[PDB]
Write an enzyme that holds these catalytic residues in place. Structure first.
Site, PDB file in Angstrom:
ATOM      1  N   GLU A 190     -83.519  57.344 -55.944  1.00  8.22           N
ATOM      2  CA  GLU A 190     -84.741  57.880 -55.360  1.00  8.22           C
ATOM      3  C   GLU A 190     -85.034  57.147 -54.059  1.00  8.22           C
ATOM      4  O   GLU A 190     -85.760  56.150 -54.027  1.00  8.22           O
ATOM      5  CB  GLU A 190     -85.930  57.752 -56.298  1.00  8.22           C
ATOM      6  CG  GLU A 190     -85.969  58.839 -57.331  1.00  8.22           C
ATOM      7  CD  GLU A 190     -87.241  58.816 -58.155  1.00  8.22           C
ATOM      8  OE1 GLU A 190     -88.095  57.902 -57.913  1.00  8.22           O
ATOM      9  OE2 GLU A 190     -87.384  59.731 -58.985  1.00  8.22           O
ATOM     10  N   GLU A 235     -83.061  63.246 -63.150  1.00  9.91           N
ATOM     11  CA  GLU A 235     -84.235  62.731 -63.827  1.00  9.91           C
ATOM     12  C   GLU A 235     -85.357  63.759 -63.747  1.00  9.91           C
ATOM     13  O   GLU A 235     -85.628  64.254 -62.663  1.00  9.91           O
ATOM     14  CB  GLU A 235     -84.695  61.440 -63.148  1.00  9.91           C
ATOM     15  CG  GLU A 235     -85.656  60.614 -63.973  1.00  9.91           C
ATOM     16  CD  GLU A 235     -86.147  59.384 -63.226  1.00  9.91           C
ATOM     17  OE1 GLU A 235     -85.293  58.554 -62.826  1.00  9.91           O
ATOM     18  OE2 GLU A 235     -87.371  59.234 -63.062  1.00  9.91           O
TER      19      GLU A 235
END
Length: 298
Positions: free
Chosen positions: A132, A220
């Protein structure tokens, strides 16, 4: 034998047809962060036998406290999960669970080179090189890092999927799609969502990316709010599920863990070695198991 996975346009292929796989993400591997206890063979085999999971994600912390950069034992926990996925004929995502991976290019290269040398001959492996990224440039920050890490993996493992994180906590897949990684096969792009916070706006950016001809992988997702906590958002989760099923998008739910937060799949004290009865799953966990076990066969 799980099928070798490849990319053609916006599709991940198995045996010449679009295919997709559903499973769980482990929590942070980091030492003293709690989730480390679930990084074992018994959990992996239980996810397969009880949840019918086809995928597990090893979330290896990096620059966060207790992570790989300062504690290499993180990698032993990863190895345990990878070995168990292969033994159970499950896909496994080796995740460099960083927010700042562009700062740690040489460490990432050395790590993915070791993983590729050891595990690259297996169909099971999926490399996820940058969990991320934050609010940083795709072209100027993420893509140079990706190019370097992909070059290093591909020299050893010419085939297995590499999933690349995108700007704004892996939301800006549309931006990546305007400047895709070229010169290497079987590259896909990360999309992360939490259904308590993200809905059609984020689905539209995803659709844009797909229409522009890049493949997405949801390494995710949560059913709860973006901060990992809050109520289960059932209706919006079902919307995301349909989107992913329509577009053949693989998915790993956050997280197989027992911390007191909405995203935890397990009640506190749920056994480190699996075997959890239904009353020891949280609302998030029970919904995750339902989605995973009901995922299309192919």
């Amino acid at each position: 034998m799980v099928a070798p996975l490849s990319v053609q346009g916006n599709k991940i292929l198995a045996n010449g047809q679009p295919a997709s796989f559903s499973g769980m993400s482990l929590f942070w591997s980091n030492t003293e962060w709690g989730g480390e206890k679930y990084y074992n063979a018994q959990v992996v085999s239980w996810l397969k036998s009880d949840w019918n999971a086809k995928l597990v994600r090893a979330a290896m912390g990096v620059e966060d406290e207790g992570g790989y950069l300062t504690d290499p034992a993180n990698k032993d926990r990863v190895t345990q999960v990878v070995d168990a996925a292969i033994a159970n004929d499950m896909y496994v995502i080796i995740d460099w669970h960083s927010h700042n991976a562009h700062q740690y290019q040489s460490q990432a290269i050395a790590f993915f080179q070791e993983m590729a040398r050891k595990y690259g001959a297996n169909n099971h492996v999926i490399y996820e090189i940058y969990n991320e990224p934050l609010q940083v440039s795709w072209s100027n920050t993420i893509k140079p890092y990706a190019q370097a890490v992909i070059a290093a993996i591909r020299a050893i493992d010419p085939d297995n999927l590499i999933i690349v994180g995108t700007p704004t906590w892996s939301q800006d897949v549309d931006v990546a799609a305007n400047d895709p990684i070229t010169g290497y096969q079987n590259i896909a792009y990360t999309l992360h969502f939490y259904a308590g916070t993200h809905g059609q706006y984020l689905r539209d950016k995803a659709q844009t990316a797909l229409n522009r001809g890049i493949a997405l992988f949801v390494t995710e997702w949560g059913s709860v709010n973006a901060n990992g906590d809050g109520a289960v958002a059932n209706s919006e989760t079902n919307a995301w599920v349909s989107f992913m099923k329509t577009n053949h998008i693989s998915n790993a739910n956050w997280a197989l863990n027992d911390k007191v937060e909405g995203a935890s799949a397990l009640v506190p004290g749920a056994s480190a070695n699996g075997g959890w009865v239904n009353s020891q799953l949280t609302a998030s966990g029970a919904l995750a198991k339902s989605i995973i076990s009901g995922w299309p066969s192919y």
